[PDB]
Design a protein around this ligand. Structure first.
Ligand SMILES: CCCCCCCCCCCCC/C=C/[C@H](O)[C@H](N)CO
Ligand SMILES: CCCCCCCCCCCCC/C=C/[C@H](O)[C@H](N)CO
Lengths: 232, 235, 235, 232
């Protein structure tokens, strides 16, 4: 035995940064997208989702990297000075911005990153922030149980396999700069890298296209292709 | 000189970072500290302090001094509860604005046992028994004494002791609960009932008021600092 | 301060780099782990697990429960093969979507011995011998028992043992084969033939079904992680 | 006991940088804002103010971070070269600028930061510069006492809970660059981070909106919401 399995380890399997979200933030004269709130999850994309759903439970420290790409929108010769983007983390319960100049942007206790355009992509790390002892990719249950004494069925009605409505909060991204006379549109791509990963209860990989945050399937349910029984 | 490689994240300002910075006033002779009474080393020390609960939040009683008083009486309906509130120490209106709740609303997660102290402020000639019950979540919220009896509970004799301490132990599926209304991290319910009655003699007030206080125990802990929703600024 | 020289590559984001980054939530009391059953330390552990093979992929049988069943019978033509498939554990349709193939399709290179377990699911009154053969690449794919005989092979008596393990050892010119169809890293062929026949008595089903399972051995290894082609997202 | 209180510590409670001031500095042809003087305090914002007023006395070393965001103002195709901003600290007693090119900008002994636009936000640290042994968030007294022998009531008239008129000085921010033919407007946001914090005499948090630098209250004095007495 001289061939090794260093690259098949769980840490190596997730050691790549996967894009999990693209957020559009526009700066223009203040129906608008001057600030964008994105709920944190890996299920907006399939690749990392499929890799993680190889297992039932996980525990990993995350690393987020933000790549910002700005462009003009129908500019004739209108130009702009280098922009600064504010990415504020809003955990469940904290107030959420209602405008791009709201008081919530003060970031007194909410962590925030101020990224200057043209610099290196903004990278930070997060520890395991799970309420339980491990993350639950699959939850075979509800959060509310409808009881006999409930006045109406909606009291106990809950989404299947949904644990909490506000899983880990949102990221609110704005352009701190005031509006230039010409519109500037930017895309922030968030790349998520698990680290120190531990996994439990392996599961078969998804074989059909994802349909929503659950195991629901709707279309393209015939994956295997035609092949002769005795054809090599 | 020394070859270096600029890693991603360079030239960013993270408000939670811990980096050394140049001093704008070097060689400054700072005033030495003194032993001022009341030094605080942790924020949970404040939460451990009992503070009165706005138990009554009716339209004509909230945002007054009557919102801290719960009326007890000998003429009350012994079948109905005295007071009832969910065990949400940061989202429940009666607990959100308490000192404990104020400290919690700066954090996303909380875990620990609570302590509710109920003080009877009637006459010394008034006597009675009160059943104070905590029901863990999962079942119907106790609407009767026969139900609240089945959960954790304590009987409080008004004549003997004017204050009762109902300790709610930490019993949770998750290691930490959220400081926001969530049916998955629901904490339970707290209810109060008349065990026997309030009995008063003649020439005594037949209606009295009780006060409620809430505190955190030494096992209490919070996690993931955040911004409170209580304070806002017009922009 | 310290003179430094910015080397090429500065201010780049390589998604496979391993650099330290600032913590956005410092002094966070992470929930401690517990001993959850089923911990996985390597992805090849999953590949070592035997999983059923969609051996039959006809137009009217694929993407159903009939694609895992291969029909055996006493009336079958003893000269023709039962099943035949190339030893491509990541590109062959019958092996690509197996757990082994799913793990391989995340890597560019693979090397190791395979293990095919064939299970007979007929009556206990049915008996027969099956010749399971592996032919290393280079020659004609065995179209007859006289040819498959010449390669590696095992005889499986249905009556005695209901399952047979055909181990395909690692025999390759290269140290690693590609997980993609390539005639230079071709792995070989697997074929099955009737050694004698299936013999059944009266009042017994004359047609039966066999199942196939594929697994990796302890010598198995993969290299050069990549993105799988199985999962796609509409953009 | 395995759950810890590392994040509830006073140091951790204030370990976030809170915005305390937004200052507008304009460069244009020299009624104008070519230099802006801002008095140093955390009371221009409520979040950090409320967090600090959890206690009566404090002693902390401060860390200031300046984020500058520039933009054009009605530019057609007028453009500008990268600007340099001068942030000069003027402690009480030192002369204050009367223009953007005054001699006071020489910064012979007043500390100053020259920040080049597009670079990292300008960060410096300040020690505990308090006259007393700890900062006083609340001062139940005056600075002058009206005496019987005073000629007029204005001699001893002083603001309640006001200790010194010039608490810690001001920051004067200008654009060192001469005026480009096109106007350029910049916003400097100052983020204040306490460090090595020590606090004394805990106080209940503010329950109603702040009204001025004191404990005065004017409106929105009904914080608690309606809820049934026996409603769970
Ligand atoms: C500006 C600072 C940014 C701070 C970002 C903190 C966000 C915290 C989110 C951490 C975990 C998100 C992703 C991992 C959880 C998985 O979705 C689990 N499987 C939950 O089901
Ligand atoms: C260009 C260099 C900038 C130098 C800035 C030095 C400013 C010195 C101010 C230090 C303290 C300001 C904030 C802390 C004091 C609090 O307001 C106290 N509670 C006073 O009531």
């Amino acid at each position: 035995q001289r061939r090794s399995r260093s690259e098949s380890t769980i840490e190596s399997f997730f050691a790549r940064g996967a894009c999990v979200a693209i957020i559009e933030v526009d700066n223009e004269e203040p129906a608008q997208k001057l600030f964008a709130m994105w709920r944190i999850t890996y299920k907006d994309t399939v690749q990392l989702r499929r890799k993680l759903e190889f297992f039932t439970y996980s525990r990993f420290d995350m690393e987020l990297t933000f790549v910002v790409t700005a462009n003009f929108t129908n500019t004739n010769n209108g130009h702009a000075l280098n922009q600064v983007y504010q990415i504020m983390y809003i955990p469940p319960g904290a107030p959420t911005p209602k405008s791009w100049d709201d008081y919530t942007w003060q970031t007194s206790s909410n962590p925030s990153i101020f990224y200057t355009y043209g610099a290196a992509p903004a990278r930070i790390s997060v520890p395991y922030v799970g309420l339980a002892n491990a993350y639950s990719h699959f939850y075979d249950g509800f959060a509310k149980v409808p009881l006999k004494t409930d006045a109406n069925d909606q009291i106990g009605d809950s989404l299947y396999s949904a644990m909490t409505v506000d899983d880990f909060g949102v990221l609110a991204i704005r352009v701190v700069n005031d509006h230039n006379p010409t519109k500037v549109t930017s895309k922030v791509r968030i790349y998520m890298k698990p680290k120190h990963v531990r996994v439990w209860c392996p599961r078969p990989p998804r074989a059909v296209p994802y349909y929503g945050p659950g195991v629901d399937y709707k279309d393209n349910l015939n994956p295997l292709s035609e092949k002769g029984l005795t054809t090599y | 000189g020394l070859p270096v490689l600029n890693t991603p994240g360079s030239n960013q300002y993270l408000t939670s970072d811990n980096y050394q910075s140049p001093c704008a006033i070097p060689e400054f002779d700072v005033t030495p500290p003194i032993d001022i009474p009341g030094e605080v080393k942790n924020m949970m020390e404040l939460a451990e302090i009992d503070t009165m609960i706005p138990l009554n939040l009716e339209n004509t009683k909230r945002n007054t001094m009557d919102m801290y008083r719960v009326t007890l009486s000998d003429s009350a309906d012994l079948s109905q509860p005295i007071l009832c509130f969910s065990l949400s120490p940061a989202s429940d209106p009666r607990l959100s604005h308490t000192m404990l709740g104020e400290v919690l609303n700066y954090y996303t997660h909380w875990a620990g046992s609570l302590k509710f102290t109920f003080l009877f402020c009637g006459s010394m000639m008034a006597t009675g028994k009160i059943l104070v019950a905590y029901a863990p979540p999962g079942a119907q919220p106790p609407t009767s004494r026969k139900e609240a009896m089945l959960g954790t509970h304590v009987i409080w004799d008004l004549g003997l002791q004017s204050s009762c301490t109902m300790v709610v132990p930490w019993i949770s599926n998750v290691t930490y609960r959220q400081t926001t209304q969530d049916s998955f991290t629901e904490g339970g319910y707290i209810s109060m009932f008349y065990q026997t009655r309030i009995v008063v003699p003649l020439s005594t007030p037949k209606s009295m008021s009780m006060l409620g206080f809430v505190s955190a125990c030494n096992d209490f802990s919070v996690r993931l600092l955040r911004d409170t929703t209580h304070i806002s600024q017009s922009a």
